[PDB]
Amino acid sequence: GQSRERLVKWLQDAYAMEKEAETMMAAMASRIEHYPELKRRIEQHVEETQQQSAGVQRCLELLNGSIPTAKGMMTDEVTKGVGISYAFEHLEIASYRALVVAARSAGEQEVAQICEDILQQEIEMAEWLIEHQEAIVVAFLEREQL
Amino acid sequence: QSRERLVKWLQDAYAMEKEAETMMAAMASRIEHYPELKRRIEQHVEETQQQSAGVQRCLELLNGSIPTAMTDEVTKGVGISYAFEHLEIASYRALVVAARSAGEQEVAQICEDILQQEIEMAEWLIEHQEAIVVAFLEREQL
Ligand code: NA
Ligand code: NA
């Protein structure tokens, strides 16, 4: 009842969140000239994301909830991209944690697993950025004032 | 140029803190059912006012300018709170690097102290997150 349709409600948010993530990454990847590791990483996550929402959509198809309708719409952009990248990966964490709860409460244990697995990838990814972060910042600085 | 990148990222963060302050000074008023939460956010609405003023003392020191210009609310806002505090972290960590590179050790200490508050605050949210979600759910399908 309200359990399914709250789960469906948050499933739809995420599906759309994953599409925004996929475009935000598929576009941060385009700007990288100086961090093959960084760039290499984001590319791998653009593919992982595509598989997330497709997983989310299987969950929306299962519970009869519909599948959200697409919306359109000395440079610093790389240091600050790693910063927004990290914050969105935490937006995602929080959301998926709270999905595992809306799934458990709804007794949809299969949905809950999907969500815990997507969650671990966001954690994995977020971890990748905040560790490699410091080097990216420094190299930026040393390069800028060369 | 070391100074002017430090000033540049100091400028961003001041505007960030001022957005943070106005976003929390709003979030804390939507709360009706989470006493600890409301009471925690309030406390940081002011930790925050003490942050940017600190940032400003840094902007004034380095001769840089000071920048210019049922339904979901609760759990979702908790999620955005946690994401922003994490935006902040990253930004203050990068400041600690730019301060250091620029040989402004005292600016760095400030940035490291604000970094500790954002970690402590994001820590408070994600620990208490699971309860807010659970109580929200339970409540809405009584
Ligand atoms: Na993702
Ligand atoms: Na803050």
> Within 13 Å, how many C-alpha atoms sit on residue A84's CB side?
13
Give the Cα separation of A40 and A77 in Å (integer).
Answer: 17
CA distance B60 to chain A (A): 22
- Taken in order of first residue, the domains within chain B and their CATH numbers are 1-142 (1.20.1260.10)
DSSP category for residue A29: G
DSSP category for residue A32: -
Residue A98 has its nearest CB partner, among B75, B89, B141, at: B75
Give the Cα separation of A141 and B112 in Å (integer).
Answer: 19
DSSP, residue by residue, B67-126: ------HHHHHHHHHHHHHHHHHHHHHHHHHHHHHTT-HHHHHHHHHHHHHHHHHHHHHH
Give the Cα separation of A8 and A33 in Å (integer).
Answer: 40
CA of B5 relative to ligand 1 center, distance in Å:
31
Q: Which residues of A touch B122 (CB under 8 A)?
A: 90
Q: Which residues of B touch A80 (CB under 8 A)?
A: 12, 91
Which residues crowd ion ligand 2, with CB under 5 Å?
B 20, 48
CA distance A115 to chain B (A): 15
Give the contacts of B135 (CB within 8 A, at least 6 positions apart): B33, B34
A127: nearest Cα among B116, B86, B92 = B86
Residue A141 has its nearest CB partner, among B72, B97, B138, at: B97
Give the Cα separation of A52 and A116 in Å (integer).
Answer: 11
**Which of A13, A137, A140 should we substitute to test contact with B (largest number of B Cβ atoms within 10 Å)?**
A137
The residue of chain A nearest to residue B130, with distances taken between CA atoms, is: A98
Residue B80 has its nearest CB partner, among A91, A97, A145, at: A91
Determination technique for this entry: X-ray
CA of A55 relative to ligand 2 center, distance in Å:
35
Cβ atoms within 10 A of the Cβ of B106, count? 11
- C-beta separation of B114 from B84 below 8 A: no
One-letter identity of residue A101: V
The angle subtended at Cα A14 by Cα A92 and Cα A122, nearest 5°, is 30
- Token digits for A140? 């930026």
Resolution (angstroms) equals 1.9
